[PDB]
Amino acid sequence: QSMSVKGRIYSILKQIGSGGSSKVFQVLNEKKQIYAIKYVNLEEADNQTLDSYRNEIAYLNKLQQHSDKIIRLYDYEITDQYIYMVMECGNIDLNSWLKKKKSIDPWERKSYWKNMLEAVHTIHQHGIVHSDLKPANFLIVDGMLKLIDFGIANQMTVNYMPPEAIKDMISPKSDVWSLGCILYYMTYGKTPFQQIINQISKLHAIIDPNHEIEFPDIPEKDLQDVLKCCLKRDPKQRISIPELLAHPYVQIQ
Ligand SMILES: CN(C)C(=O)c1ccc(Nc2cc3c(cn2)cc(-c2cnco2)n3C(=O)OC(C)(C)C)c(Cl)c1
């Protein structure tokens, strides 16, 4: 099986994953270099959906020059029938990696955490709030974490959902909470509310101040401060990304 993107021929090795409308493959160019190709069928796509797809591609393209913590998009082919996106190949998504890895190295965690802040910080600088941050969004590329999507594409788990989202029934700070849950998972092996199976009661716990989130004593006092600061229910009281970037946990070994 083979495909053509802007004149260049790509041999398919395997399908990495498949969404609703789209499919991602592990491919090879004529010089036997590896890439990931996102193929999106546009036959059933409506105007709003087409525009949201065009918008994420635009941002992914502009944000290339601003941060290397954003997945590389080398080429793309857009017609009325499909989209082909030529990207760099990552080893594994952070979610699938965390499911396999029971115990995480404190150095790896610090490194991945700084990467996530850099990627999320970049999208904020451009006025984008992902609003749906998850481990899955992040890709391990040569021991570096890279942000895969910006949330704009999505809508074509609730364990990472901020309280202000459920209470409103969203700002840079909504992403802070979600990142804080990713780090809480990377620290305690569980998300702050994983323990609640009933999805109704879970949402109640996320918005309830009487529900005190546990922060068991860990040898990294700075990491525990990061977690307490990120998981503040009041967005006004919650720490910011530029602040998190100067925190001793990020900046000191
Ligand atoms: C069990 N899983 C799936 C793995 O072990 C595994 C995960 C990721 C991989 N690499 C990869 C995935 C990629 C990209 C580059 N490289 C680019 C994207 C992408 C899609 N929209 C924007 O960007 N993308 C993506 O959506 O991937 C999934 C579907 C896994 C999130 C590989 Cl080879 C294996």
Side-chain angles (χ1 to χ4, degrees), residues 2-7 9-13 15-17 19-22 24-29 33-47 49-99 104-113 115-133 135-153 157-166 168-169 171-189 191-194 196 198-211 213 215-216 218-220 222-223 225-227 229-231 233-235 237-253:
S2 182
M3 45 175 73
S4 195
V5 185
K6 307 292 252 304
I9 310 167
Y10 297 91
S11 317
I12 295 123
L13 302 183
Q15 188 192 270
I16 293 164
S21 178
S22 62
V24 56
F25 311 99
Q26 196 167 48
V27 312
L28 289 179
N29 78 353
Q33 283 149 52
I34 199 164
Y35 299 92
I37 294 187
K38 187 185 193 175
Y39 161 75
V40 183
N41 177 14
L42 307 169
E43 290 176 313
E44 217 181 51
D46 58 84
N47 309 310
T49 317
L50 277 169
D51 218 62
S52 82
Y53 286 3
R54 277 162 188 154
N55 198 252
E56 231 189 280
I57 299 167
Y59 275 111
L60 183 67
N61 186 29
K62 200 201 201 300
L63 262 64
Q64 294 296 287
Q65 318 119 61
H66 294 92
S67 193
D68 71 309
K69 299 325 179 298
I70 288 149
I71 198 205
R72 309 288 85 194
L73 179 72
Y74 303 100
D75 228 359
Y76 58 81
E77 192 152 79
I78 319 162
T79 70
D80 294 336
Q81 309 87 53
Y82 57 87
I83 301 162
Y84 275 133
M85 286 164 71
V86 184
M87 298 185 288
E88 81 193 308
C89 207
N91 317 117
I92 191 169
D93 59 293
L94 190 70
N95 185 237
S96 291
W97 184 71
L98 284 166
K99 294 194 276 144
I104 172 158
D105 164 42
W107 196 99
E108 268 203 275
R109 175 165 63 238
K110 207 183 275 273
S111 180
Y112 290 166
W113 177 253
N115 291 160
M116 297 182 232
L117 300 178
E118 187 177 345
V120 180
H121 187 225
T122 314
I123 76 176
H124 286 187
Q125 279 170 308
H126 292 85
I128 302 148
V129 169
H130 185 291
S131 80
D132 201 33
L133 274 183
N137 307 121
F138 294 98
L139 197 77
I140 315 178
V141 181
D142 323 301
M144 210 181 285
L145 238 57
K146 292 178 179 243
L147 186 62
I148 273 322
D149 75 321
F150 307 152
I152 315 157
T157 199
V158 295
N159 286 323
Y160 309 89
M161 204 187 290
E164 63 264 44
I166 317 149
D168 148 66
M169 311 288 172
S171 62
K173 303 250 187 123
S174 299
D175 282 342
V176 175
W177 178 276
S178 305
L179 290 175
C181 298
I182 295 173
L183 185 70
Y184 191 103
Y185 185 40
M186 278 178 134
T187 304
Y188 296 108
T191 49
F193 306 91
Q194 205 131 267
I196 307 125
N198 193 285
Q199 302 296 292
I200 296 171
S201 304
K202 176 118 82 181
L203 294 185
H204 275 174
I206 305 163
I207 63 146
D208 177 43
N210 305 308
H211 188 284
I213 300 166
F215 293 91
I218 52 168
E220 298 179 80
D222 288 359
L223 173 57
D225 183 74
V226 164
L227 292 170
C229 283
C230 288
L231 304 175
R233 289 188 180 96
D234 182 19
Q237 290 302 302
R238 192 171 314 145
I239 195 161
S240 76
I241 299 270
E243 246 142 43
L244 280 164
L245 282 161
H247 192 284
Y249 176 73
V250 161
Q251 294 287 330
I252 320 168
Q253 53 267 30

